[PDB]
């Protein structure tokens, strides 16, 4: 679990969005596993606007942060799950690092701010959904 709180927006994994997220929907994209909902309170986070390929992510299944080197956002095949059919997930960055399904929502940050959230992984890999291209998150 986990979310990004920026301005009057909450960014979560689309497969973990709640009834309240869907009732206050701003934008969603099944291909990216992202959903953004509106909030009444101002949020705690800043979004990175950069091309960093190194950063640090939070891993809930270890209660620890890990440094990673990650690939540039791209289209990557993701096997079928209870939430989606087998498909290509876009804007996804891969890294070598521990992750389990419940780690989705953990934030990846670089020196410029939030880069994305955990969305895929397994077998010593972790995949992050990028948010750096969503310029409207800041206005
Ligand atoms: N093992 C593992 C693992 C680690 C981090 C994350 C995951 N992700 C998942 O559990 N899913 C199932 C729900 C939809 C997700 C999607 N992006 O299509 C993929 C697995
Ligand atoms: Zn950066």
Describe the SSE topology.
Elements: E1 4-6, E2 9-13, H1 19-23, E3 25-29, E4 34-38, E5 54-59, E6 64-69, E7 74-78, E8 87-96, E9 107-110, E10 113-122, E11 125-130
Antiparallel strand pairs: 1-2, 2-4, 3-4, 5-6, 5-9, 7-8, 8-11, 9-10, 10-11
Bound molecules: (3S)-N~1~-(3-cyanophenyl)piperidine-1,3-dicarboxamide and zinc ion (ZN).
Active site: 15 (for protease 2a activity), 33 (for protease 2a activity), 104 (for protease 2a activity)
Binding site for Zn(2+) 1: 50, 52, 110, 112
Subunit structure: Homodimer.
Q: Tell how many strands the DSSP assignment holds.
A: 11
Q: Given the helix and strand composition, which structural class is it?
A: mainly beta
* Shape summary: globular
Report the C-alpha radius of gyration, rounded.
14 Å
Subunit structure: Homodimer.
Active site: 15 (for protease 2a activity), 33 (for protease 2a activity), 104 (for protease 2a activity)
Organism: Coxsackievirus A16 (strain G-10)
Protein name: Protease 2A
Write a concise synopsis of the structure shown.
The chain is mainly β and 139 residues long.
């Amino acid at each position: 679990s986990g979310a990004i709180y920026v301005g009057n927006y909450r960014v979560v994994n689309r497969h973990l969005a709640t009834h309240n997220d869907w009732a206050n929907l701003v934008w969603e994209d099944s291909s990216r596993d992202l959903l953004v909902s509106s909030t009444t309170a101002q949020g705690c986070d800043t979004i990175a606007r950069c091309d960093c390929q190194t950063g640090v992510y939070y891993c809930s299944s270890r209660r620890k942060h890990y440094p990673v080197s990650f690939s540039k956002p791209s289209l990557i095949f993701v096997e079928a799950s209870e939430y989606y059919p087998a498909r290509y997930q876009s804007h996804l960055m891969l890294a070598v690092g521990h992750s389990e399904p419940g780690d989705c929502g953990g934030i990846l940050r670089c020196q410029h701010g939030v880069v994305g959230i955990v969305s895929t992984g397994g077998n010593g890999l972790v995949g992050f959904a990028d948010v750096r291209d969503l310029l409207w998150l800041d206005e």
